[PDB]
Amino acid sequence: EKEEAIFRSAEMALVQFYIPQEISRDSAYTLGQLGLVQFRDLNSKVR
Amino acid sequence: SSFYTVVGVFIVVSAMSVLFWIMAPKNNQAVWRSTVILTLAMMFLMWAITFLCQLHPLVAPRRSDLRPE
Amino acid sequence: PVVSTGKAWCCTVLSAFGVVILSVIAHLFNTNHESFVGSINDPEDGPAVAHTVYLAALVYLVFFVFCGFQVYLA
């Protein structure tokens, strides 16, 4: 089922998360305990 | 002798390489299929370059000391 | 004893490769081989110089069993 990705690269996908504030501090641990999401910076050009 | 020795060994190794493309295991499939086939190629090419240049040599050894026994 | 961590292993490995290599060198001096005895500037007597290499193989075997027990203390 799971591909090999040693001849070429693995196939990626961009995923959008709508997270409520009351479970925002909770779901961050769930996405940290599984280490397979690379977040990208949406608040660029903000000091 | 026989330059056709190299061609015969080439036919045997190129038959054993195509036979392993359809016999490699499914789990680490591209690692078996590229390590095993491409080491037969380089192991063949080094033997073929070493077996040639001794097929029809231009230079003979001398060995000036060589005890007569 | 000795330091027995960096000084016993450094002698047991050297003595383990001292028995194996000198034995086959003495064997290839025992039978005439044309690579060990084949030159006019080369040892002549043949299997007489196998004796003085075989004794060094035995000396390295003595060092091997003497330093192999000194790591067996722990």
CSV table of C-alpha atoms in Angstrom, one decimal:
chain,number,residue,atom,x,y,z
A,1,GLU,CA,0.0,0.0,0.0
A,2,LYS,CA,2.7,2.5,1.1
A,3,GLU,CA,5.0,3.4,-1.8
A,4,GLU,CA,8.7,3.2,-1.7
A,5,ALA,CA,10.0,6.6,-2.8
A,6,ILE,CA,13.6,5.7,-3.3
A,7,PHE,CA,13.7,5.8,-7.1
A,8,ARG,CA,12.0,9.2,-7.1
A,9,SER,CA,10.5,11.4,-4.4
A,10,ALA,CA,7.3,10.7,-2.5
A,11,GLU,CA,4.1,12.3,-3.6
A,12,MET,CA,3.0,15.3,-1.4
A,13,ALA,CA,-0.3,17.0,-0.6
A,14,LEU,CA,-1.1,20.4,0.9
A,15,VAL,CA,-3.7,20.1,3.7
A,16,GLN,CA,-5.7,22.9,5.3
A,17,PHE,CA,-6.7,22.8,8.9
A,18,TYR,CA,-9.7,24.7,10.4
A,19,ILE,CA,-9.0,24.3,14.1
A,20,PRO,CA,-11.3,25.7,16.8
A,21,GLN,CA,-9.6,27.8,19.5
A,22,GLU,CA,-10.9,25.6,22.4
A,23,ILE,CA,-9.0,22.6,20.9
A,24,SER,CA,-6.2,24.6,19.2
A,25,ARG,CA,-3.7,23.9,22.1
A,26,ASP,CA,-5.0,20.3,22.2
A,27,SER,CA,-4.7,19.4,18.5
A,28,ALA,CA,-1.2,20.8,18.2
A,29,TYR,CA,0.0,17.9,20.5
A,30,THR,CA,-1.8,15.4,18.3
A,31,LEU,CA,0.0,16.8,15.2
A,32,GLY,CA,3.3,16.8,17.1
A,33,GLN,CA,3.1,13.3,18.5
A,34,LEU,CA,2.7,12.1,14.9
A,35,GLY,CA,5.7,13.7,13.1
A,36,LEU,CA,4.5,13.8,9.5
A,37,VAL,CA,3.2,17.3,8.8
A,38,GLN,CA,5.5,20.2,7.7
A,39,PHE,CA,3.7,23.5,8.4
A,40,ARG,CA,4.2,26.5,6.2
A,41,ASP,CA,4.3,30.1,7.4
A,42,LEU,CA,1.1,31.9,6.7
A,43,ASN,CA,1.9,35.0,8.8
A,44,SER,CA,4.8,36.1,6.8
A,45,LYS,CA,5.5,39.9,6.5
A,46,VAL,CA,4.3,40.3,10.1
A,47,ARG,CA,6.9,41.5,12.7
B,1,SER,CA,41.8,-17.3,-27.6
B,2,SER,CA,38.2,-16.7,-28.6
B,3,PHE,CA,36.9,-13.1,-28.5
B,4,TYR,CA,33.5,-14.9,-28.5
B,5,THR,CA,34.3,-16.0,-24.9
B,6,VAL,CA,33.5,-12.4,-23.8
B,7,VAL,CA,30.3,-12.3,-25.9
B,8,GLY,CA,29.2,-15.7,-24.5
B,9,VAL,CA,29.7,-14.6,-20.9
B,10,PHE,CA,27.9,-11.4,-21.9
B,11,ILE,CA,24.9,-13.4,-23.2
B,12,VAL,CA,24.8,-15.4,-19.9
B,13,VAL,CA,25.0,-12.4,-17.6
B,14,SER,CA,22.4,-10.4,-19.7
B,15,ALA,CA,20.1,-13.4,-19.4
B,16,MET,CA,20.6,-13.6,-15.7
B,17,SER,CA,19.9,-9.9,-15.4
B,18,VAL,CA,16.5,-9.9,-17.2
B,19,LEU,CA,15.6,-13.0,-15.3
B,20,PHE,CA,16.0,-11.1,-12.0
B,21,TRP,CA,13.9,-8.1,-13.1
B,22,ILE,CA,10.9,-10.5,-12.9
B,23,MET,CA,12.0,-12.3,-9.8
B,24,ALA,CA,12.9,-9.5,-7.4
B,25,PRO,CA,11.0,-9.3,-4.1
B,26,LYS,CA,8.1,-6.9,-3.6
B,27,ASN,CA,9.1,-5.3,-0.3
B,28,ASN,CA,12.2,-3.4,-1.1
B,29,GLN,CA,11.7,-3.8,-4.8
B,30,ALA,CA,13.7,-1.0,-6.4
B,31,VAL,CA,16.6,-1.6,-4.0
B,32,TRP,CA,16.9,-5.3,-5.0
B,33,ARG,CA,16.3,-4.5,-8.7
B,34,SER,CA,19.0,-1.8,-8.9
B,35,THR,CA,21.7,-3.1,-6.6
B,36,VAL,CA,21.9,-6.7,-7.9
B,37,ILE,CA,21.6,-5.9,-11.6
B,38,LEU,CA,24.0,-3.0,-11.6
B,39,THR,CA,26.7,-4.9,-9.7
B,40,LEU,CA,26.6,-7.7,-12.3
B,41,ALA,CA,27.2,-5.0,-14.9
B,42,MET,CA,30.3,-3.6,-13.3
B,43,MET,CA,31.6,-7.1,-12.3
B,44,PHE,CA,31.2,-8.1,-15.9
B,45,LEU,CA,32.9,-5.0,-17.3
B,46,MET,CA,36.0,-5.3,-15.1
B,47,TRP,CA,36.4,-9.0,-16.0
B,48,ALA,CA,36.0,-8.2,-19.7
B,49,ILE,CA,38.5,-5.4,-19.6
B,50,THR,CA,41.0,-7.7,-17.8
B,51,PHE,CA,40.5,-10.7,-20.1
B,52,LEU,CA,41.0,-8.5,-23.1
B,53,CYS,CA,44.5,-6.9,-23.3
B,54,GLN,CA,45.8,-10.4,-22.6
B,55,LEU,CA,44.1,-12.0,-25.6
B,56,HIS,CA,46.7,-10.7,-28.1
B,57,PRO,CA,49.5,-9.1,-26.2
B,58,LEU,CA,52.2,-6.8,-27.7
B,59,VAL,CA,54.7,-7.1,-24.8
B,60,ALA,CA,56.3,-10.2,-23.2
B,61,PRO,CA,57.9,-10.3,-19.7
B,62,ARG,CA,61.7,-10.5,-19.2
B,63,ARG,CA,62.6,-11.6,-15.6
B,64,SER,CA,66.4,-11.4,-15.7
B,65,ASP,CA,67.2,-13.1,-12.4
B,66,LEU,CA,65.1,-16.4,-12.4
B,67,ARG,CA,66.9,-19.4,-10.9
B,68,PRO,CA,67.2,-22.2,-13.5
B,69,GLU,CA,65.1,-24.8,-11.7
C,1,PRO,CA,48.2,-6.9,35.4
C,2,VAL,CA,48.2,-4.6,32.3
C,3,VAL,CA,45.7,-1.9,31.3
C,4,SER,CA,43.6,-4.8,29.8
C,5,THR,CA,41.3,-2.6,27.8
C,6,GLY,CA,43.4,-0.8,25.2
C,7,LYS,CA,46.6,-2.8,25.8
C,8,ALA,CA,45.3,-6.4,25.9
C,9,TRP,CA,43.2,-6.2,22.7
C,10,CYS,CA,46.0,-4.3,20.9
C,11,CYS,CA,48.2,-7.4,21.5
C,12,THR,CA,45.6,-10.1,21.0
C,13,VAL,CA,44.6,-8.8,17.6
C,14,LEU,CA,48.3,-8.4,16.5
C,15,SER,CA,49.1,-11.9,17.8
C,16,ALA,CA,46.0,-13.4,16.1
C,17,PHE,CA,47.1,-12.0,12.8
C,18,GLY,CA,50.7,-13.0,13.7
C,19,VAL,CA,49.9,-16.8,13.9
C,20,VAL,CA,47.9,-16.9,10.7
C,21,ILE,CA,50.1,-14.9,8.3
C,22,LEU,CA,53.5,-16.3,9.4
C,23,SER,CA,52.2,-19.9,9.2
C,24,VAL,CA,51.3,-19.6,5.6
C,25,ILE,CA,54.5,-17.8,4.9
C,26,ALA,CA,56.5,-20.6,6.5
C,27,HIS,CA,54.4,-23.1,4.5
C,28,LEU,CA,55.2,-21.3,1.3
C,29,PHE,CA,58.9,-21.4,2.2
C,30,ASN,CA,58.6,-25.1,3.0
C,31,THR,CA,57.5,-26.0,-0.5
C,32,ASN,CA,59.5,-24.1,-3.2
C,33,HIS,CA,57.1,-21.6,-4.7
C,34,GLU,CA,59.1,-19.5,-7.3
C,35,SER,CA,57.6,-16.4,-5.7
C,36,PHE,CA,59.3,-16.8,-2.3
C,37,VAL,CA,62.3,-18.7,-3.7
C,38,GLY,CA,62.7,-17.8,-7.4
C,39,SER,CA,65.4,-15.1,-7.6
C,40,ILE,CA,69.1,-15.0,-7.6
C,41,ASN,CA,69.0,-12.4,-4.8
C,42,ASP,CA,66.7,-14.4,-2.5
C,43,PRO,CA,67.0,-17.0,0.4
C,44,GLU,CA,68.6,-20.2,-1.0
C,45,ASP,CA,68.2,-22.9,1.6
C,46,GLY,CA,64.4,-23.4,1.1
C,47,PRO,CA,62.8,-25.1,4.0
C,48,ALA,CA,65.6,-24.0,6.4
C,49,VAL,CA,64.1,-20.5,6.7
C,50,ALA,CA,60.6,-22.0,7.2
C,51,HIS,CA,61.9,-23.1,10.6
C,52,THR,CA,62.8,-19.6,11.8
C,53,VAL,CA,59.4,-18.3,10.7
C,54,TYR,CA,57.6,-21.2,12.3
C,55,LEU,CA,59.2,-20.5,15.6
C,56,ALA,CA,58.0,-16.9,15.3
C,57,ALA,CA,54.5,-18.2,14.7
C,58,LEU,CA,54.9,-20.2,17.9
C,59,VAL,CA,56.1,-17.1,19.8
C,60,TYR,CA,53.1,-15.2,18.6
C,61,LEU,CA,50.9,-18.1,19.7
C,62,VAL,CA,52.5,-17.8,23.2
C,63,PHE,CA,51.7,-14.1,23.2
C,64,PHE,CA,48.1,-14.8,22.0
C,65,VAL,CA,47.3,-17.3,24.8
C,66,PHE,CA,49.1,-15.2,27.4
C,67,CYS,CA,47.2,-12.0,26.5
C,68,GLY,CA,43.9,-13.8,25.8
C,69,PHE,CA,43.6,-14.9,29.4
C,70,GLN,CA,44.3,-11.4,30.7
C,71,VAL,CA,41.0,-10.1,29.1
C,72,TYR,CA,39.3,-13.2,30.5
C,73,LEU,CA,39.9,-11.9,34.1
C,74,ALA,CA,36.8,-9.7,33.6
